[PDB]
């Protein structure tokens, strides 16, 4: 904030409305001047804003960790991780997805057994051993998965 002190006050003749803002031209070439030798011109420093960025990064990391969501989904970038490191880093999210799969699969099996019971299907209604099948939630590259399954 540019600050001026000791300037000639009482100016602009009781500063009016209807524009009257001459908008003193201060470009790169202009030299700002004042006749009074007691006048002082200086600037007030500004906030860094870096601490806010670091705090926001920490808070988003906290949210990602508490939600069991991978950090790079919410903030930052994923560093180059090998297969084992990647498996360990996404183990929490995969396990949470598996728990959700178990609960929602129990609910889905209940729904499908009720549907079978509605349409007759006495065998299907009482078949509590049957369960739904979920698609893979593992984050693994195609090459690694194919190599492992072919070797198996």
């Amino acid at each position: 904030v540019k600050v001026a002190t000791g300037i000639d006050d009482l100016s602009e003749d009781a500063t009016p409305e209807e524009q009257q803002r001459a908008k003193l031209i201060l470009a790169q070439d202009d030299i700002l001047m004042h006749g009074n030798h007691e006048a002082k011109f200086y600037t007030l420093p500004e906030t860094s804003l870096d601490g806010f960025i670091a705090a926001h990064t920490q808070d988003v990391e906290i949210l990602a960790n508490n939600a069991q969501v991978p950090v790079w989904i919410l903030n930052g970038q994923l560093a180059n991780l090998s297969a084992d490191a990647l498996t360990a880093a996404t183990k929490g999210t995969i396990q949470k997805l598996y728990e959700r799969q178990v609960t929602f699969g129990a609910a889905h099996n209940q729904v499908l057994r009720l549907a079978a019971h509605v349409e007759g299907d006495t065998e299907g209604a009482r078949d509590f051993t049957a369960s739904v099948s979920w698609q893979d939630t593992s984050v693994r590259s195609l090459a690694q998965a194919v190599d492992a399954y072919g070797k198996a």
């Binding site: 007030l44 420093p45 500004e46 906030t47 601490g51 806010f52 705090a55 906290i62 960790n65 508490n66 069991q68 929490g92 396990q95 949470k96 598996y98 728990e99 178990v102 609960t103 129990a106 009482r126 509590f128 051993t129």
Partner: protein, 253 residues
């Protein structure tokens, strides 16, 4: 808290109203505190009421770390089979009982309760399946709804008497070795004498509750993952609260 050798049909009401229920409530208060700690409401070691502007900041800095720990340890504990010694196949009877009771999902709740409160219970009562024969029903019981009494806490497999509170809170059941008595409870602690104590003979042979201990200890300390790590979580919350205050009051020139 001496355990009577046997409870008569006429002593059930007096015993429940005098000896068992006050102890159940005493344990329930602490267990409710533990439960609310695990949901993000960590204890406040430093209270600064009558500001309403720093109180909101304090509520902003509270993060469910203990709940995160409990959830992380719960998601990894899953039972996939019950096999005999030296056999690759699941035992037909026990595994069919496990599946018929939908234990694949209820084990999650049992493990959560055991990890949170330090212990948890599962009730095995007789029942009949859709085809008949005999199919026991297994129901996980929260520690906040069961008061199990052991003559030897460390070295016992079943309790002597267990006081069970219904999941709707309307009835209280007292369990014994062979029979359980059901009492109607309109209000917490109110057991009208007009009600007749219903007696049901389950015939299990022992108390049908099995305890899931989180930590094995010879001193009987049933320790949970929540109350063991309260100071550290509160320390993290206090540090976050300090940072919030600093950026709320001393963040700009």
């Amino acid at each position: 808290i001496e355990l009577p050798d046997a409870i008569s049909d006429g002593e059930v009401r007096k015993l429940v109203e005098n000896e068992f229920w006050p102890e159940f409530v005493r344990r329930r208060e602490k267990l409710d505190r533990i439960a609310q700690w695990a949901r993000g409401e960590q204890p406040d070691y430093l209270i600064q009421n009558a500001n309403r502007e720093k109180r909101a900041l304090l509520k902003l800095a509270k993060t469910p770390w203990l709940g995160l720990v409990v959830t992380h340890f719960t998601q990894a504990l899953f039972v996939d089979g019950y096999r005999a010694e030296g056999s690759k196949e699941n035992a037909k009877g026990p595994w069919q009982t496990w599946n018929a009771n939908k234990m694949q999902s209820k084990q999650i709740a049992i493990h959560r309760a055991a990890l949170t409160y330090g212990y948890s219970y599962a009730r095995v009562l007789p029942g009949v399946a859709l085809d008949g024969a005999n199919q026991a029903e297994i129901h996980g019981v929260s520690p906040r709804r069961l008061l199990a009494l052991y003559e030897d806490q460390i070295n016992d497999e079943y309790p002597k008497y267990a006081l069970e509170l219904a999941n709707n809170g309307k009835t209280v059941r007292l369990y014994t070795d062979t029979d359980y008595y059901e009492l109607r409870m309109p209000s917490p602690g109110n057991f009208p004498n007009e009600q007749v104590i219903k007696k049901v003979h389950h015939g299990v042979g022992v108390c049908p509750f099995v305890r899931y201990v989180n930590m094995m200890d010879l001193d009987g300390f049933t320790m949970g993952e929540v109350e063991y790590l309260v100071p550290v979580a509160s320390k993290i919350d206090k540090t976050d609260y300090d940072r919030l205050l600093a950026q709320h009051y001393n963040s700009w020139k």
